[PDB]
């Protein structure tokens, strides 16, 4: 068996778990983008890419067991559900949390705006390259990836252009411009800084905890700070296992997932290597919820929103990433970056039309709203009386006219018949509204 | 001393339609041997040596400097900058080929070309709304009888004296 997981997860622990079950595990770089093009027996990733994989047909639908369904949390099953069928086996629920240094600061900042001042006392930094870490601050003030109405996602509407998203991104670029956070830093640099205690506070998921546990520096985990009185709403990730459609060992991989990995011993061996967070298995989660860090993770998950599993997600991410970079490095303004993300999210646009709209937004930002409206219109456009009967000696026929009074109609028809040389007896039937003239 | 350096020798003079206004020795200006036109109305240039003093700065073309005078009629005097008929103060103008003229033309400076009605003395109009020549509305959109009210000076280095860039400062007391 071949397993692909991210480089920051517990690859070693999964290796021993597979060894107890041969099983081979690898951690290739950029596996979320390598998987669609290459096609590994099973891949562990967040549920957002799994919907796109299922639409492309790369993931084989798994036959579940009702007892197995009852053994795990139901909302995880709903999250890994696409069009009413289950495409993956949930493993863990991971959400971002604020990890601060106890020695550097007694209590975490309650609001985002306090963070600048605190920072200028030290003279906060995290991963800015990936939009997963930046998104909570953008979405704190109403920004949404896709409108969720009556349980369904509206692809036609994208909320990355809301005034809340603009406010969040302009606050973040103000933090960057105040020399408070490095624009070029990534996950690895942020981790290295936090182990050495250079930075007081950071945003990270459960998986990083073990590494900090190796640095033996005291760390406190809590909810992300509120933005303008509104809490940050981080995307909730469901780290799940997807079985490849072309897997020659589909049944073996399914049995390994059901009976060996998703067990108390398997989860406790994996979590020791790297903290998975809120696990999907009920008993281990109950035995682990006593740890305050899992409680903070679950609180952040409750405050935040789970990632959609629609196939229009990955492209979205790319757009947002670009937007964040366009705001992080100062190459272009916040509003322009959000307009570019909105353009890039549109699925039906041809490459030439998309490039044209990108150029039009580049060279004139004064009418950006009208450009976006026309682009959205293009994207939607490319989405795949009284009657007379005369019986004379010469003419026989009929004629209909518009008259309000019967007397007026009979006078008009008398004039018409005289005009046509008809002179004879007249009869009228009001039931059928017919003037019958004959000789 | 009064800051005449900020006024006369400033690198940047605004267009005449948005002429610069500033609030405040004159014999040095009278005999500076650098001033092409220095004409004073209501006062003697040599007897200047006053509670309110205002300096107006703009750049026009050569054959329109005579429009900066009381009682004159013309595009600069009508739709750009009008002086009162009882004006007490005066006008200075000098050639600015070396500074204001750039090879290939200098089209930065502007003047207002259309307006619904003439302008009262001592006021500045900065509005840049579409002018209506006819009766149909423009809705801030050009078209037939819808014209942009501003126009640029083509201050090429090869232009004659009549069309050369003149810098004009008006000292009103």
């Amino acid at each position, epitope marked *: 068996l071949v397993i692909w997981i991210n480089g920051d997860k517990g690859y070693n622990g999964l290796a021993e778990v597979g060894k107890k079950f041969k099983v081979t595990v690898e951690h290739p770089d950029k596996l979320e983008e390598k998987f669609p093009q290459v096609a590994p027996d099973i891949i562990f990733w967040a549920h957002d890419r799994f919907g796109g994989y299922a639409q492309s047909g790369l993931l084989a639908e798994i036959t579940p067991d009702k007892a197995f369904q009852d053994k795990l949390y139901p909302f995880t099953w709903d999250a890994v559900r696409y069009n009413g069928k289950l495409i993956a086996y949930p493993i863990a629920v991971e959400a971002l949390s604020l990890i601060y240094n106890k020695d550097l600061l007694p209590n975490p900042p309650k609001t985002w705006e306090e963070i600048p001042a605190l920072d200028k006392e030290l003279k906060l930094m995290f991963n800015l390259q990936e939009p997963y870490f930046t998104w909570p601050l953008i979405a704190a003030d109403g920004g949404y990836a896709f409108k969720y109405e009556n349980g369904k996602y509206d692809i036609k509407d994208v909320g990355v252009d809301n005034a809340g998203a603009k406010a969040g991104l302009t606050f973040l670029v103000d933090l960057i411009k105040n020399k408070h956070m490095n624009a070029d830093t990534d996950y690895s640099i942020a981790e290295a800084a936090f182990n050495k205690g250079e930075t007081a506070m950071t945003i990270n998921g459960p998986w990083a905890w073990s590494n900090i546990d190796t640095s033996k520096v005291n760390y406190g985990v809590t909810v992300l700070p509120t933005f303008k009185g509104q809490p940050s709403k981080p995307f909730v990730g469901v780290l799940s296992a997807g079985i490849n459609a072309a897997s020659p060992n589909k049944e073996l991989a399914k049995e390994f997932l059901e009976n060996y990995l998703l067990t108390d011993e398997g989860l406790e061996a994996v979590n020791k290597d790297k903290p998975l967070g809120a696990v999907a298995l009920k008993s281990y989660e109950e035995e682990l919820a006593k740890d305050p860090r899992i409680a903070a993770t679950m609180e952040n998950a409750q405050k935040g929103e789970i990632m959609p599993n629609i196939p229009q997600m990955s492209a979205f991410w790319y757009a947002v990433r670009t937007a964040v970079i366009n705001a992080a490095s100062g190459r272009q303004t916040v509003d322009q970056a959000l307009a570019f993300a909105q353009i890039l999210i549109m699925p039906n646009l041809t490459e030439e039309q998309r490039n044209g709209f990108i150029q039009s937004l580049k060279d*004139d930002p004064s009418v950006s709203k009208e450009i976006l409206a026309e682009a959205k219109k*293009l994207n939607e456009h490319q989405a795949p009386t009284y009657k007379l009967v005369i019986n004379g000696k010469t003419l026989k026929g009929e004629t209909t006219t518009k008259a309000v009074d019967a007397e007026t109609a009979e006078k008009a028809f008398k004039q018409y018949a005289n005009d046509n040389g008809v002179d004879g007896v007249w009869t009228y039937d009001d039931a059928t509204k017919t003037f019958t003239v004959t000789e | 001393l009064c800051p005449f350096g900020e006024v006369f020798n400033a690198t940047r003079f605004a*267009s005449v339609y948005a002429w610069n206004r500033k609030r405040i020795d004159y014999s040095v200006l009278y005999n500076s041997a650098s001033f092409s036109t220095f004409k004073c109305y209501g006062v003697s240039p040599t007897k200047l040596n006053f509670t309110n003093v205002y300096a107006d700065s703009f750049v026009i073309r050569g054959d329109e400097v005579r429009q900066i005078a009381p009682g004159q009629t013309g595009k600069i005097a009508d739709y750009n900058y009008k002086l009162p008929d009882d004006f007490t103060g005066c006008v200075i103008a000098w050639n600015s080929n070396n500074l204001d003229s750039k090879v*290939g033309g200098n089209y930065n400076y502007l003047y207002r070309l259309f307006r619904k009605s003439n302008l009262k003395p001592f006021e500045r109009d900065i509005s840049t709304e579409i002018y209506q020549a006819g009766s149909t509305p423009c809705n*801030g*959109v050009e078209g037939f009888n819808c014209y942009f009210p501003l*126009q640029s000076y*083509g201050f090429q280095p090869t232009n004659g004296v009549g069309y050369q860039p003149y810098r004009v400062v008006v000292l009103s007391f």
Partner: nanobody, 121 residues
Framework: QVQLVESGGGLVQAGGSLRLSCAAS????????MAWYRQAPGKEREWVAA????????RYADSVKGRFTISRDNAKNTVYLQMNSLKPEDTAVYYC??????????????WGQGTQVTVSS
């Protein structure tokens, strides 16, 4: 002295895009107004877009607001009209235009040769 030469355009399918260029010689592209007009075969020449140096930077006709845009480049002395979501109604000859008065308030409306844009369907 003043010369306006248009380039670009040609034939594009409905919904495509184009970038008309107007190269200007004899005057800097940063001036009072540079505009783009369209003329259809058998209709009257009408105004499409314009870029100014004062007030609102760009103005557009009602029928082409959003789809079109106009920008200027000082380094190459050019005006670019980017046309997106083109429709068969946009089939016309486009001229870049300036208004320069010589000396006597008889402003010579300087036009270019014009480029044909045919938006097929």
């Amino acid at each position: 002295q003043v010369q306006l030469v248009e380039s670009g355009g040609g034939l594009v399918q409905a919904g495509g895009s184009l970038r008309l260029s107007c190269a200007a010689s004899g005057f800097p592209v940063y001036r009072d107004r540079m505009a783009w007009y369209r003329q259809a075969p058998g209709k009257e020449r009408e105004w499409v877009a314009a870029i100014y140096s004062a007030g609102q930077q760009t103005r557009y006709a009602d029928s082409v607001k959003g789809r079109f845009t106009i920008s200027r480049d000082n380094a190459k002395n050019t005006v670019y009209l980017q046309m997106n979501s083109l429709k068969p109604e946009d089939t016309a000859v486009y001229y870049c235009n300036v208004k320069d008065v010589g000396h006597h308030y008889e402003y010579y409306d300087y036009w270019g040769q014009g480029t044909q844009v045919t938006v097929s369907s």
